[PDB]
Design a protein around this nucleic acid. Structure first.
Ligand SMILES: [K+]
Ligand SMILES: [K+]
Ligand SMILES: [K+]
Ligand SMILES: [K+]
Ligand SMILES: [K+]
Ligand SMILES: [K+]
Ligand SMILES: [K+]
Ligand SMILES: [K+]
Ligand SMILES: [K+]
Ligand SMILES: [K+]
Ligand SMILES: [Mg+2]
Ligand SMILES: [Mg+2]
Ligand SMILES: [Mg+2]
Ligand SMILES: [Mg+2]
Ligand SMILES: [Mg+2]
Ligand SMILES: [Mg+2]
Ligand SMILES: [Mg+2]
Ligand SMILES: [Mg+2]
Ligand SMILES: [Mg+2]
Ligand SMILES: [Mg+2]
Ligand SMILES: [Mg+2]
Ligand SMILES: [Mg+2]
Ligand SMILES: [Mg+2]
Ligand SMILES: [Mg+2]
Ligand SMILES: [Mg+2]
Ligand SMILES: [Mg+2]
Ligand SMILES: [Mg+2]
Ligand SMILES: [Mg+2]
Ligand SMILES: [Mg+2]
Ligand SMILES: [Mg+2]
Ligand SMILES: [Mg+2]
Ligand SMILES: [Mg+2]
Ligand SMILES: [Mg+2]
Ligand SMILES: [Mg+2]
Ligand SMILES: [Mg+2]
Lengths: 97, 193, 148
RNA sequence: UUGAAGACAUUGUCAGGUGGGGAGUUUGGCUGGGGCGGCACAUCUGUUAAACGAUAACGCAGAUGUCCUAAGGGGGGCUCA
RNA sequence: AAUGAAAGUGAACGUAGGUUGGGGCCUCGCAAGAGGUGCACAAUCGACCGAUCCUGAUGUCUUCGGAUGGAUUUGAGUAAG
RNA sequence: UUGACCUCAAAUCAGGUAGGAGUACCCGCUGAACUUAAGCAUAUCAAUAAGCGGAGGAAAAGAAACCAACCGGGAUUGCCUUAGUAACGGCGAGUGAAGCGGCAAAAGCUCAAAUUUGAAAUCUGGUACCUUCGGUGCCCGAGUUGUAAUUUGGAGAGGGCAACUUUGGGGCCGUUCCUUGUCUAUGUUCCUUGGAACAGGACGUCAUAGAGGGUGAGAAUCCCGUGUGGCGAGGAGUGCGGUUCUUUGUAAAGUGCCUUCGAAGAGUCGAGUUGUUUGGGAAUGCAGCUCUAAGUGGGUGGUAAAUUCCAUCUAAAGCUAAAUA
């Protein structure tokens, strides 16, 4: 950042000598380990796809990602989740071929 | 129920407010009890002081960031810099706080100073025998008071570069207000090539 | 105390000062601000114009500390130097050893320009300044240093 | 165990209808009692009105909820029953 | 310290203004008076700050900046607390 | 045929445990209307009364999926403030919090997810014995569909290297804390009135005691007490001050450097919709139904949406004194 030392504008605030604190391990919450990468892969192989995922792979195949995202949104709630989900189904389609 | 030239009032007594009136008649009694409990605690804990040592911190917000005050506890980094572990420090009368981070060298250095001055001015009895009569000081807060740091000198030379603080403030306010539009213009320009 | 109230002087006069005809009944007129647009309109329009209706924009979750900016006029200003040190600084008007006045330390957020200062250079530290306050400080040979 | 029945129905949640069976509530004012009628309830002209102004009655004789790109504005010529 | 819905901005052209009154005080008069000074307070014309509407200088991330000067506009303001 | 296992039963089987009371305060559920709005329906009264369930000396809350936007603070609770404010509201009547700041009190932590795998290292019960709020043998049993040790994000783990530091558990005797007992000054001297002197007058005495009460009328000094101090008895509890016995250590813990890693809670989160509730406004919380995630993820950042950043915590598992009622 580097504050400007005045009380308005872009980087307002007092200039002080900065430290940089040691990274808190809590900030790595839900980072993928080797263990979880492996287990998650295996369970996908065993369990396979859910009905809505199957509708999504079919819709990508025919009507393209636009219409897929629209359905994934309805099904999951978020658009952020729908983007991520259609990305995951693109990689399932690409792995089979 | 409206008449004359009087302020409009807002007296909220339309609930059963007389069920929940708290008159503090025990004010004097609660003060005697609080004092007896300090005395009783002091005896149980003697010769230790009634309080832990606490760091200095900057108050948050623009309204109070000009002040320093006692914080909850020393950082893990400050305790390490003072040549101490958190587990040990907790037992020797120092408050430690795992949540607070150091992002400012002045406050960090001052807190490390506090911990050094404290370790100088205590005597930890060994965990066996010998125990020499120390005498109880009740307040770490009175022994190690929090000084407000000094900003400047009393007087010095005037240095005028002819800029205008007022203009500096206006320009800073304006630069912020148009940053975003001026980025969009210097994309829509640079795109069309 | 009860002994100085008119309740004591009304003892023996029937109506307690409330009239024979009209009487002291419970709530003729309705309770509280009942009737502000009906039978109490004239009072409301005469003494509380502006009472009904909305103006301006809402602000959800307003924190008053954001708006903290107490004002100091130049009129004062020399009040911030302690009275011991004030008299020496006024007679020894020097560009080389002008007093520093940290107006934030004193608990102020903006220097406004009302009135007149002595013709004695001063260094004023402040978060904000009016245009005229700055002109008056510079016209006395001072400077405004902006701080945060 | 034996008949029937079968992904229908049932049950759950939401949606539209029905619902004085039931719930809650309301159902102006003025007024020669009240009601019916009327509007004297927002108004305008003349009179009552007592030659400043104000002035009542469910006093008298009437009118208003519109209408007009001219039936507004300016100028000219002309003169009506 | 106000003002503005807000972003914001924020109170001396001058002996902190002029005019008319104004207790008291001062000077001169035996006194009547005449002159000077006039606080509080009253009326009035200005000036200052914010809002609104105009004006739009030097400059310049060429769209920012907003000097200067105005207005039958406006404020619960300033004008030795 | 014999013996397991799984699941489910029976017994006046062995040993336990719940219920009811009280209910001021506390944790929930359910839930009005009178009333106010000069009428009345939303609103208000009130997230109150009544009803129901559940605790304790306190309860609850609690060591951030927090507040912020600062030069940042740092579990919870409570007080003073914030503030009759931001906001809600037939924008009517009315309602109405939070952050920061000052204070009281202060205290921190535990699981799940890991191969002990060169040794289920763990635990209930029965039984015998003993120094019995328990200990030691022995025997059944529980348990691998996982009981111990090890680690909890502040971290931490596995390897490798180098170093120094620090420790347990008893009795016994004082103090402490509570509950009690006992001992500890001085006129009943004279006169008057009166049934009675504790009244009046006179002359004294004690006072760290002239608080209070009793006694035939207003009693420091008649009696009990009061004041000051002394001496006992009975527990409770190591809180901590001394002494004595056993020294746990091939154990345990802490610390620097290098290296490889770093498991982190799902019908949840989130979304839609319905109802209720909140100051919470394109939705504050809660609940039903439908949909239903991720792992450089997820939540929050008080105006819905897409795009790009940033800041801040680490949910869906758990315990905890005090300040408060
Ligand atoms: K009266
Ligand atoms: K069906
Ligand atoms: K229905
Ligand atoms: K019906
Ligand atoms: K009639
Ligand atoms: K039983
Ligand atoms: K609330
Ligand atoms: K809701
Ligand atoms: K922080
Ligand atoms: K984030
Ligand atoms: Mg009378
Ligand atoms: Mg009467
Ligand atoms: Mg009356
Ligand atoms: Mg009915
Ligand atoms: Mg009638
Ligand atoms: Mg009228
Ligand atoms: Mg007339
Ligand atoms: Mg015409
Ligand atoms: Mg039995
Ligand atoms: Mg009532
Ligand atoms: Mg009512
Ligand atoms: Mg009424
Ligand atoms: Mg009624
Ligand atoms: Mg009840
Ligand atoms: Mg009990
Ligand atoms: Mg307590
Ligand atoms: Mg508890
Ligand atoms: Mg934690
Ligand atoms: Mg806190
Ligand atoms: Mg106030
Ligand atoms: Mg309420
Ligand atoms: Mg360890
Ligand atoms: Mg007596
Ligand atoms: Mg309810
Ligand atoms: Mg708990």
């Amino acid at each position: 950042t580097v504050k400007t030392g005045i009380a308005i504008g872009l980087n307002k605030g007092k200039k002080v000598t900065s430290m940089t604190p040691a990274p808190k391990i809590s900030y790595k919450k839900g980072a993928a380990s080797n263990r979880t990468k492996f287990v998650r892969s295996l369970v996908r192989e065993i369990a396979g796809l859910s009905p809505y995922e199957r509708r999504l792979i079919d819709l990508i195949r025919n009507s393209g990602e636009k219409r897929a995202r629209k359905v994934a949104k309805k099904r999951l709630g978020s658009f952020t989740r729908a983007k991520a989900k259609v990305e995951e189904m693109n990689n399932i389609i690409a792995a089979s071929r | 129920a409206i008449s004359k030239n009087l302020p409009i009032l807002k007296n909220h007594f339309r609930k059963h407010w007389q069920e929940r009136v708290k008159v503090h008649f025990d004010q004097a009694g609660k003060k005697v009890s609080r004092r007896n409990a300090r005395a009783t605690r002091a005896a149980k804990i003697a010769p230790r002081p009634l309080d832990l040592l606490r760091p200095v911190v900057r108050a948050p917000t623009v309204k109070y960031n000009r002040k320093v005050r006692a914080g909850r506890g020393f950082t893990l980094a400050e305790v390490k810099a003072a040549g101490l572990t958190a587990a040990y420090a907790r037992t020797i009368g120092i408050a430690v706080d795992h949540r607070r981070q150091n992002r400012n060298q002045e406050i960090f250095d001052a807190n490390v100073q506090r911990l050094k001055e404290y370790q100088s001015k205590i005597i930890v009895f060994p965990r066996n025998g010998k125990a020499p009569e120390a005498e109880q000081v009740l307040s770490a807060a009175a022994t190690f008071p929090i000084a407000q740091p000094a900003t400047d000198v009393e007087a010095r030379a005037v240095q005028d570069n002819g800029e205008s603080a007022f203009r500096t403030l206006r320009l800073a306010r304006s630069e912020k207000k148009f940053r975003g539009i001026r980025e969009k213009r210097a994309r829509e320009k640079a795109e069309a090539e | 105390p009860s002994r100085f109230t008119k309740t004591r002087k009304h003892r023996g006069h029937v109506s307690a000062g409330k009239g024979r005809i009209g009487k002291h009944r419970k709530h003729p007129g309705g309770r509280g601000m009942a009737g502000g647009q009906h039978h109490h309109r004239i009072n409301m329009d005469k003494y509380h114009p502006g009472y009904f209706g909305k103006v301006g924009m809402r602000y959800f979750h307003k924190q008053q500390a954001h708006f903290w900016k107490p004002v100091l006029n130049l009129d004062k200003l020399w009040t911030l130097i302690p009275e011991d040190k004030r008299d020496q600084y006024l007679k020894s008007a020097s560009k080389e050893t002008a007093p520093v006045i940290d107006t934030l330390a004193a608990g102020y957020g903006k220097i406004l320009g009302k009135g007149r200062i002595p013709n004695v250079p001063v260094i004023v530290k402040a978060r904000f300044v009016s245009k005229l306050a700055e002109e008056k400080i510079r016209a006395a040979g001072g400077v405004v240093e902006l701080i945060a």
